[PDB]
Amino acid sequence: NLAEKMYKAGQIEFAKGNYETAIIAYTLALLKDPNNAEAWYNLGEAYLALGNYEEAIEAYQKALELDPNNAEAWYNLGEAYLALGDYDNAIEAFTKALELDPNNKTAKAGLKLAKEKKAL
Amino acid sequence: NLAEKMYKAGQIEFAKGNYETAIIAYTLALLKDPNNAEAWYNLGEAYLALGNYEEAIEAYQKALELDPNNAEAWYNLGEAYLALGDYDNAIEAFTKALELDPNNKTAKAGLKLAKEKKAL
Amino acid sequence: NLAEKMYKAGQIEFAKGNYETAIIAYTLALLKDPNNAEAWYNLGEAYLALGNYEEAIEAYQKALELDPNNAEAWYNLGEAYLALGDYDNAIEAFTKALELDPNNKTAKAGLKLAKEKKAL
Amino acid sequence: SLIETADLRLLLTTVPTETEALYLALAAVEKGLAAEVLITPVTRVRRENGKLVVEDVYRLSFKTTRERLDALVAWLQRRHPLALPECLVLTPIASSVAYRDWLRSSL
Amino acid sequence: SLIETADLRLLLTTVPTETEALYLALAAVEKGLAAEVLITPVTRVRRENGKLVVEDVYRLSFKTTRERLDALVAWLQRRHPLALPECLVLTPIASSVAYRDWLRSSL
Amino acid sequence: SLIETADLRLLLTTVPTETEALYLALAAVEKGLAAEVLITPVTRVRRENGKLVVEDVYRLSFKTTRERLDALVAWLQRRHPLALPECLVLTPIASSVAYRDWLRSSL
Amino acid sequence: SLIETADLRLLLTTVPTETEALYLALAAVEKGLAAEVLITPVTRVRRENGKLVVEDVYRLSFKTTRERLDALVAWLQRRHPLALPECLVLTPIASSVAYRDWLRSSL
Amino acid sequence: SLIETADLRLLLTTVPTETEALYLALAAVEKGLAAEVLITPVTRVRRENGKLVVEDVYRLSFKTTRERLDALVAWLQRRHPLALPECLVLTPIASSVAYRDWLRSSL
Amino acid sequence: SLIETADLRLLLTTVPTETEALYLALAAVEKGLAAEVLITPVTRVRRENGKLVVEDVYRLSFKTTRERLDALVAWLQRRHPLALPECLVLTPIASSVAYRDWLRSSL
Amino acid sequence: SLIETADLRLLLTTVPTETEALYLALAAVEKGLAAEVLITPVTRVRRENGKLVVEDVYRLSFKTTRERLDALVAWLQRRHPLALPECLVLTPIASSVAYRDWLRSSL
Amino acid sequence: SLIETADLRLLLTTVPTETEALYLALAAVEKGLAAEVLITPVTRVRRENGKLVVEDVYRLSFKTTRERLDALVAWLQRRHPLALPECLVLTPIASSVAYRDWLRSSL
Amino acid sequence: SLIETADLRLLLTTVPTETEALYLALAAVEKGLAAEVLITPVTRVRRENGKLVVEDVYRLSFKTTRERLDALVAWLQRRHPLALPECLVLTPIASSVAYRDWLRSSL
Structure with missing residues (x-):
């Protein structure tokens, strides 16, 4: 009952940007x-x-x-790993994301960046 | 102890309009x-x-x-029922409110609106 | 885990002044x-x-x-006692604060104000 | 004495029946959204859905501070029975200091 | 939502009888000179030809765009039955965007 | 023709009974304090001494030059039967040159 | 039709390789930070660490609302691979109303 | 010598294929609508009908006087193959007097 | 962080061959006239001596302080191989404070 | 070097005894409310409760940023021993850039 | 609370001996010319009649309304013992509303 | 008589010992950099290198024309014993014409 009330309050807050x-x-x-x-994922984007x-x-x-079945969560985790300089776990994250969703040029590209950046 | 501290914080917040x-x-x-x-009622106005x-x-x-003895709560519930288009429960709410407080031209009037609007 | 997350959120909030x-x-x-x-002390400054x-x-x-070993807390309590007009407890607070930290011209001075103001 | 003022706006609105007129005014005043409300009987002739129509309506005039203006107008537009709420604001250039203090106190 | 506006003027005028009031309003609206017209019963007490006079009159309020304003006022002054036509214009500072689009479409 | 004007103010005031309304208007006009005065029947609903009250009142609209404004408002506030006189002023941005000359002559 | 606009800024930025160019553009557009992004192949000749250098780079042009501008620029500067991010903003004075409505809807 | 200028606008537009790009430029220049036209090969990545799309496009830059601007933009929008024509205008603050005289002569 | 700026101008110029493009850019940068220079391959279609002509050209973009602007433009116009030098200046409204300090130091 | 400044205000205040003077200054500086405080011995001659009085007082001068000004003045007025706190603010028009950076860092 | 003010001026003046300092302050305050006066011991080093001189003087600071300013300054200059009276005025930009009401009442 | 003035600035500065105070004042006045200089004994309490410190200092007040202001401030900052010179300028809005002529003659 009340939990989803505060949940909806959370998203309507996130829309306003007051993180x-x-x-x-x-x-x-x-x-x-x-x-x-x-809720865990939404706190993740926050x-x-x-x-x-x-x-x-x-x-x-x-x-x-x-919940291991969120390709978008995998992609966001990969972007975070990129931000940290952690490249390998980003590679596995993008591979699993494209396994879950192949038709995402974002995931293919991010795999490409990881390959190039680990190369240097 | 602390509960009424957060309660007073709640009203001082409500005065500021940051709902x-x-x-x-x-x-x-x-x-x-x-x-x-x-607290329940104040969350209601919020x-x-x-x-x-x-x-x-x-x-x-x-x-x-x-607490069934709040005529103002009855009136606010009736205004909400009006806002939703729910007219009957608004009628009972206003009747009970005027029973609890007759000398409220607001309650008599709102009963009148309910009668007119249900009429159409 | 999460408690220190909300704690850090609390200080980063306090830095912004939204008390x-x-x-x-x-x-x-x-x-x-x-x-x-x-957390108790930080709520105190808040x-x-x-x-x-x-x-x-x-x-x-x-x-x-x-935790009785916070001289700064003693000094802040003394300033509060000054604000209330409670002078004696302010005197003991400043004495204990200077006992814990003597090389604080603030504490010596505040003891002086307490003496002068109790004098009148 | 008269002093120049800039925090006053005059909200103009009309409704069909004097009932809902006084109801909206009453709701606004009781919760402090609008401390000054007036009602007048008026006749409205409009071009509705491509046709001209004659009707008798009731005009509302609302004066409030610019700070409370946004909340009041939002409450109106979500609560205005017509899906196309009336919103017209006029600002007086000056008033007595007595109203300045009083309305600041009462709003 | 409310937006600041500057192309709205409020034309104030009065006439003796509600007949010619509604006639002028009707003529203005039918040819699109004024898409918004209101009428009110009022009592006028004036100093006429050096003497004070009491009479009941009917006040007209006209809101239109500044571009159409000149044509409307010229049509009034040449058509106003009194050789000394009434011309008073007031501009609201803001309104809902819904009226902005609608009145732009309807004017 | 229409010309921009800046020396006109619209004084808004209400009183309980139409008697003292017409009396104040008459006194202002006879001594030239206000050459233009109007009266309307209105209903006032106010929060009095912490309580809401319904009453029928009569609204006064006064237009005069800014130079005569101070004298008129002072005469009102000392003479207004309520110890808290009504003072609301609105300025029209433009008018016909005919009224400019006439009101300058008549005020 | 063309209307005057003031809420549009053009962000100019360059990066070495077209990969990270399209990546930054893609990341901005997918989360709605920038709904309009362009890429061009360019050659950059700069004075680096006291020496002149020739390189081929790729220029980014970003148009967004002034309200979303701060968030986008902050996200860039924290995320821009160079510790000295590129920040150049140009405002167009006018555009079609069709883009005004569309970009308001799409941004 | 450089002089401050205010009658120059830069129209930004893109089309899919360089054919219709050069056609629009040619049609504008031959009839004197636009005496200065440029073309560049660009890659456009857009969110189309809810989906992201990659395409290579060709950008048009048009500089003309503000007097000829309205005719040119109207001709574009009625003639632009997309029903949602591109309209972005940028004004340079100054230029050589030589271009001032020449473009005045050539436009 | 982004700060409002007003001492930046964007000089637009084109030349036939990329050689003299890079030469002018190099000469400007080496003597500190222009610390920021860019080159792009472009196609120019112009009405020459009454006839339309197609050619591939190379566009120059120069950003510098307004104080150094006059010297740079004079050096260009006396040194520009065409007797009718290109002079188009655009000012960005804001930039990062990091570039403000850096370009002030490097210009 | 000297640069124009607008975020500096000079708060003027006096107290009877140099004790509470230095106490208020110390409290303000220790918590960063006021990073710059001065004290002077002064003689005050005032009309108190209808009578003239001679006394020796101590004047406080406070310079701080306009952003921190409201918090400091509120803390004063609630904390000022006299129920009628002293509030006088003066803004210097310019200062050295060295103080601009330092006080921004220290405030 | 703090409010913006514009009717306050700070008159700066010095005299040799604290006697005539307190006398001028006393005379101004007793007749209501200046309700706020301060005295400080200062050392003055001046170029007198072509020669530098060291002396200890006493500085006067006068705050009053702009309406009373002219009378006070005239009374000073005719009454100032030196035939070349000191006249320096500084205006604070804001103050507490409490002083606004009090000084209006006391001046 | 009092006249409005705009070429006067008040330079505020403090030094530890009254010696170098009078030396700086003397050097400024003898070479005509500052014809008006004052000294006061003050107590300074500052946060030095992260620690609060109590000291007695001496404040300098310099009034000069805006034309001579730059030279004086440059001479100070290069000559100020502290590597972080004090620079605070205040402008009086008006003064007697007698000082206008005299200070123009003496500065």
Whole structure:
């Protein structure tokens, strides 16, 4: 009941760009239900938008832990790994993402960047 | 102790018009005490102000459930029912409100609007 | 894990000056861990900044209760006691603060103000 | 004494029946959205759906601060029974300082 | 949503009898000179030819674009039954974008 | 022809009964304080002493030059039966040159 | 039809290889940061670390609303591979109303 | 010598194939609508009908006087093969007096 | 961070062959007249001596401070191989403070 | 070098005894409310409660950024021992860039 | 709360001995010419009659309304013991509303 | 008589010891850089290198014409014993014409 109320509050907040308030809402929500894959992922984009990377990563493997079938989550994790300079795990993330969704020129391209950047 | 601290924080927030933050504060407060009629009602005005109606309604019957003696709550519920196009329950709400407080030209008038609008 | 996430969110909020949101974050955090002296103290500066004094005081003796070794907390409590007109407890607070940290011309001075103001 | 003012706007709106007129005014004033509301009986002749129509309507005049203006107008447009709410704002250039203090206190 | 506007003027005019009031409004609207016209019953007390006079009159309020304003005012002054036509214009500072598009389409 | 004007203000005021309305208008016009005065029947709903009240009132509209404005407003506020006089001024941006000359002559 | 516009800025930027060019453009467009992106092959000759250098680069042109401008530029500068990101903004004075509505809808 | 200028606008437009690019440029120049036209090979990546698309396009840059601007833009929009014509205008702040005289003579 | 700027101008010029393009750019940069220069391959179709002509040209883009602008433009016009030098200047409204400091240091 | 500045205000205030003077200055500086504070011994002669009085007081001069100004003034007025706090602000028109950077860093 | 102000001026003046300093301040305040006066001990080093001189002087700071400013300055210059009176005026941009009301009442 | 002035600036500066204070003032006045100089004993409490410090300092106030301002400030900053010279300028809005002529003659 109330958990999805605060969840919708969280997305309507995220639409407004006030990231920290959405962070607070998502923490409060996961206090109710620590087992919402959608909430975990949405907190993931929130962390990514604000830019602090490590907790974004941790939320990402958490989200993949309770739900491994999100190609977009894989792609976002790969972008984060690129941002950190971690290239290998980015490679596996993009490979798995394109396995889940091949017709994403974004995923193919990002694999290409990883190959080129690891090359140098 | 702390519950009324966050409660006062909630009203001082509501005075500032930043509705979503007050929503978050009220959710946090009801996590402490789910049995505060005043907190339920205040969250009700918050929902009404932001405009999302259904959860405002649910908070309203919750508030009337733990405290049925709030004529102003009855009137606000009736205004919400008017906003939704639900006219009958608005009629009973206004009747009960005027029973609790007759000398409210607002309640008599709103009963009149309900009669006229149901007529058409 | 998450508690220090919301804690860091709290300080980054306090840096922005939006005091009430930091208040909410700190309440949520202490709901997780009511035993964080740093969180108690930081909520103390938050209350002091917003200006409502009594709950600032209560948070201060709470913080000194779980950690009595914060001279800066003693000094802030003394400033609050000055703000309230409570002069004696301010005197003991400044004495204990200078005992913990003597080389603080602020503490010596504030003791001087307390002496002068109690004199009149 | 008269002083120059710039935080006052005059919201103009009309509705068919004096009932919902007084209801909207009452709802605005009771929750402090609009502390000053007026009603007048007027006749409206409009070109509706390509045809001219004669009707008697009731005009609303709302004066409030520019800070409260956005909330009031949003509440109107979401709550205005017509899906195409009326929104016309006029600003008086000056007023007595007595109203400045009073309306600041009452708004 | 509300947007700032500057192409709206409010023409104020009064006539003795509601007949010629509605006639002028009707003529203006039918040929598209004025797409928005209102009528009100009012009482006028004036100093006529050195003497004060009490009479009941009917006030006209006309809102139109500044581009059509000159044609409308010229048509009025040549057509106004009194040789000294009434000409008072007021500009609202803002309105809903919905009226901006609609009145642009309807004017 | 229409010309831009800046010396016109519209004073808005209301009183309970049409008697004192016409009296104030008459006193202003006879001594030349206000050469143009109008009266309308209106209904006022106000929050009085913490309570909402419904009443029928009568609105006054006064247009005069900015030079005579101060004297008129002072005479009102000292003479207004309510100790908290109504003072709202609106300036039209333009008018016919005919009124410019006439009102300059008549004010 | 053409209308005057003021909420459009043209962001100019260059990168060495067309790969990361299309990657940055793709990332911006997919998340709605930049709905309009262009790429061109260009040759850059610069004075690097006190020495002149010849290289072939790829220029990026970004047009977006001024409201989304700050977020996009911040995302660039934190994400731009060079620690000294390129930031050049040009505003067109006017455009068709069709793009005004479309880009408002698409941005 | 360089002089400040204000009657120059830069029209930006793109088309799929260089054929119709040169055709539009040729038609504009031959009838004097646009005396200065340029073409460049560009790659366009757009979100079409909800999907991202990669294509190679050709960009047009048109500089003309503000007086001839309206005719040229109208001719474009009625003649632009896409029903949603491209309209982006940029004004240079100054130029040599030699171009001022020449373009005035040639436009 | 992005800051508003007003001392940047974009000089647009074209030459037939990429040789003299890079020569002019090199001469400007080596003596500090222009610290930022770009080259692009373009096709020019012009009405020459009453006849239309197709040719492939190379466009130059020069950004420099307004103080150095006059010296650079004079050096160009006396040194431009065509007796009718190209002079088009565009000013960006804002840029990163990092470029403000760097270009101030490098120009 | 000297540059024009607009974010500096000079807060003027006096207190009876140099103790609370230095205390207020110390409290402001330690928490970063005011990074620049000065004290002077002065003699104040005032008309108190209808009577003239001679006293020796101590004047405070506070310079801070306009962004921090509101917080500092609010902290003063709630904390100023007199219920009628002193509030006088003066803005210098220019200063050295060295102070601009330093005070921006230190405030 | 702090409000913007424009009717305050700061008159700067110095005299040799603190006697006539306090006398001028006392005379100004007792007759309401200046409700706020301050005195400071200062050292003055001046080029007198072609020679440099060291002396200790006493500086006066006067804040008053612009309406009373002319009378006060005239009274000074006719009454200033030196035939070349000191006249330096500084205006604070803002102050607390509490001083606005108080000084308006006390001046 | 008092006249509006705009060529006066008030330079504020402090030094540790009254010696170098009077030396700087003397050097400025003897060579005509500053014809008006004042000195006051003040106490400075600053946050030095991360630590708060109490010291007694001496404040300098310099008034000169805007034309001589640049030379004086440059001479200060190169000659100021601290590598971070104090530069604060305040302009009085008006003064007696007698000082206008005298200071113009003496500066």
